[PDB]
Amino acid sequence: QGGYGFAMRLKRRNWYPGAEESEVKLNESDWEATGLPTKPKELPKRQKSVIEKVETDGDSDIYSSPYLTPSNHVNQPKNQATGHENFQYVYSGWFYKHAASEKDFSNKKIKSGDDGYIFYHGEKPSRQLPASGKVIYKGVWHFVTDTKKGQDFREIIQPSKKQGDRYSGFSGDGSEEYSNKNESTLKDDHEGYGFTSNLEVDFGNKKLTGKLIRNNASLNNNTNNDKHTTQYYSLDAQITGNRFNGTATATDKKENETKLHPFVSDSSSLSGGFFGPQGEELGFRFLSDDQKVAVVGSAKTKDKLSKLTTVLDAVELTLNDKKIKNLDNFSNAAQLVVDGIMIPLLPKDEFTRKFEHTPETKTYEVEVCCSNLNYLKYGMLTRKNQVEQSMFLQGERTDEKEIPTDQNVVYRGSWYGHIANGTSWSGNASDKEGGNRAEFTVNFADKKITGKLTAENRQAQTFTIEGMIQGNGFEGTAKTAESGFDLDRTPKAYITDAKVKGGFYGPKAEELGGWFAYPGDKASSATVVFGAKRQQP
Amino acid sequence: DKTVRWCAVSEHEATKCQSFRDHMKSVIPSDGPSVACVKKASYLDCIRAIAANEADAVTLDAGLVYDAYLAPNNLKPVVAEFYGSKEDPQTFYYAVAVVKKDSGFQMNQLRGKKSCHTGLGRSAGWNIPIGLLYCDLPEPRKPLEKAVANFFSGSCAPCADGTDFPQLCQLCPGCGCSTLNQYFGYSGAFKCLKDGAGDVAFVKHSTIFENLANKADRDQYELLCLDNTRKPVDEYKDCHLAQVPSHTVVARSMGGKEDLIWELLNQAQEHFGKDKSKEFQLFSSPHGKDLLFKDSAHGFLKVPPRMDAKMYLGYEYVTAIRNLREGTCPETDECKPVKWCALSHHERLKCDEWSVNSVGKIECVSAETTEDCIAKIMNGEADAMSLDGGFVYIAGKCGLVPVLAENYDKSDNCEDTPEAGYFAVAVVKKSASDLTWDNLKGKKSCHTAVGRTAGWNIPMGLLYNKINHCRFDEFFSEGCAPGSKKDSSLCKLCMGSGLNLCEPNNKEGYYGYTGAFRCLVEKGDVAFVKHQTVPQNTGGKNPDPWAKNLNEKDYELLCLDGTRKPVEEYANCHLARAPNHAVVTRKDKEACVHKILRQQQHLFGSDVTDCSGNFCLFRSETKDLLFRDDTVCLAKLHDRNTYEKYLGEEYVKAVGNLRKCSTSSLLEACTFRRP
Ligand SMILES: [Fe+3]
Fold first, then answer.
1. Where does a domain end: B226, B244, B262?
2. Membrane spanning segments where (chain A)?
3. Does A58 contact B366 at a Cβ distance shorter than 8 Å?
4. Are B284 and B375 found together in one domain?
């Protein structure tokens, strides 16, 4: 339910005389995934490609937010929050062109007016966050409204094009006259230029609040107004992992007053995530509950010139070259993100599960354990269209605060592994009987973890793990005992001192998982991912 | 190294060009423009060479100018050869159709008549008249000579193939191609009309003036006009088949070096032009006739930047030649869709709604500026639009005519009731006092847009008479005058965003009457607008946040006599009277436009009560889209169908008094074709 980004397309109402659509509202169905940007400052490919193909009468240009990389079109419009202007990971904004009317008279349809999208997208969703503290994020926001016959928002967009009636009102409209976007200087209480966002993220309490405002213009008549900013919303959200969820509250309501602007309803759909190495940037959307308004935004910590905590683990281990890659993940252990697409790890509609996912180039073949693990998933991932081999593990780490102190805690589980010297043994996660078996004892007080992985004929077929715990995760080594695995008188395989890394997952460390590849050093080789659940005493 | 590469079509030309090069070198300083001669096989080759940036200029006849303009050559007219005199230069000649007095037939009555042509493949003689008649010819229209032979009852078509198409030689048997044929050439054709051989002669305007022995006796003849009336022979500027440029030098449209070329040619005519030098004659050579320029050239004129090949050749010429090249005829017979020209997207959106509601009797074309739109109407690209009187003035000089007028006065007699026009007023804040018409200097100004009646022409012309000099951006400290040069001080107060700033369309919020008033409110000292603007925008009449709370009693009008009066007093305080805005078109579309608009306004006009559920042609939000928002109706002009007759002698003098200050490109181009 997380993602790299989302966009919402402007609506064009059908005015065909006598066939006229009274209104077109917005839905949650209308969000489109942007997919991972190659360059965040550029427009999202899929949607740009849509607007490119849109017909125009003589203005063929795609107009966009001023800080976006244009294609194509001192002075000139600014949208930024002062002191947080410089975005690396995340961008929000809009792009449109002035489209020709679309006429099908066989169906009695004409849609007129601009065509485009509001969107946000980011790269490198954060796997780490500040472990506490309150932090200011400032940024920008943008909106797109529904269309209703007779509707206008006079306080935001001057309705010479019938904005809000024939096509969506949106923050990009050329007719939107009351922001300070075009001025050369800021008043002291201005937060910046145009529509700017302000958030306070409390990483200690896992909570965020904020306000979305417009910065108003000041010249001559109207300088009587004393208020250089106007606040349309406040925000509240619960942070979990790198994602947050919450509500938006419409700030300006005198009601019973009918309104000269779109922001009226509150929202229960506020959603977003942190991007960058520390989660120093974020982007978000919400859709008002009356479906009259949709918003996207981005915000970032103060531009340049607390200890961190690890929120998740996501790893791919390539079977051939014996390499470990980090996978992006949205702090959903059930969403596998590879090659910029999201594989559902759970069914739509048993212990270990195999399926094929063909996105809409490649086809992915996925075996995933386990049915009893909610915060962690691990298994085999294979790529085809001829075939590439991998195993994966991902889990949502337990809060560093929620970690158990119990001195004896037993975890039981399974593993996938592939191991060779001269010949290959491979075996898969099973919930009995002579199948792959994983055993762990954890002394949390002592910060020590030991375990053994036993294979089919056991053991015999075995692995020994000792590690130290820090915070929400552990490191250690794995050894084959002596001498060799048996790789099945028989050939064996020799691994001493494989580096093991892992974490604790879900509330109160209900689950644990980990992995190692080998060699990483200067013989034999192995790759293993394992995961286990916390037993009762 | 600034070098004009001239294109030669023959070795004789090449050697003349080299003589040209060498003689220029003796006159132009080393550092300046020089000639390079490049030789090609033919004019086509030259045109391609220029487009390929292998060369720079060449001089073409009219037909080739059109060819040069087409993709992928995209070449444009830059310099013009002129003839016959310096004080009254002939850049153009007029192809006319001359007939006898009271012979009672018009241009659309030609089928069946007897025709006299100067000769086949000649411009005025053949290509123009046959091209304009092309659709009237019976099918098959290929081959052309056969079709023509079936259209006229008989002809003299010198050079025509008489063997295959006898009736083409009927009036000059054999169709002789030399002056041995008494009917060949210009005089030949005219003598064919005079002899009573044919009913009509296709010649140029100078032909009868030259070939009449008695020279009175011109009253025995008339000219056929494209609107299917006849005018006297002297009226040819107003009655003609096409206006064609004689010899035109062309260059690339982009990166064409038009400056260098004009510097070179201008210096060349100074030293080597008519009678200027014994050493070298630009306009003759020993080697042959008409090398690089016509031997009859008296000099060169610069073609204005705004011009492009279509605009320079003119509507009628392009129509005739396109008919001939393309050959597409419409399959019918009553009024075709009127193509309305909209200003940017704001007007385009409303125009689309209009078209859907008129069920196709109206169609839509956009341009980003009024001048752009007017030019499209000249083209054929567009048919009509409504214009501020300052622009009905420009459109007039561009050959467009007024058809219906916007009436702002409320009555039940509206369409039939001519109006004297509205008032141009100078509007200031009551709070700011002691600022008077007497000195506005150094103050900050707001105009509807440059070249418009109230916002520009009236007030600036008056100011011009006071100050006797053209730079008004120096006179005012700052202002907003949309359509001004973007780096001007008159662009500084403009609210337009980024490159929209000071643009003369609705992308700039200070554009137009309301735009200007909002400028006075929010920035300026004085706004130039129509007398109705302040009452339209105060007392809550305007709902938008900026004008929502505005009160009428807070403003005053500047009187010419140096006093001030409340805005209601506008009758006794005003700068001048402004002619109502009017719809304009091409003469050929004028009947259709008059009839279609009368029907359209009976449907969507101010008789429409509820403007939400239904389309109101005369309303928009403060923006005057396609028409002034106060238009009550569109009214009959009657005899007032020319811009001069429509605007009145007084306004046309005032705008003319401002000619020296004009930044208009389109006006420059138009007055060049027709002073
Ligand atoms: Fe006007």
1. B244
2. none
3. yes
4. no
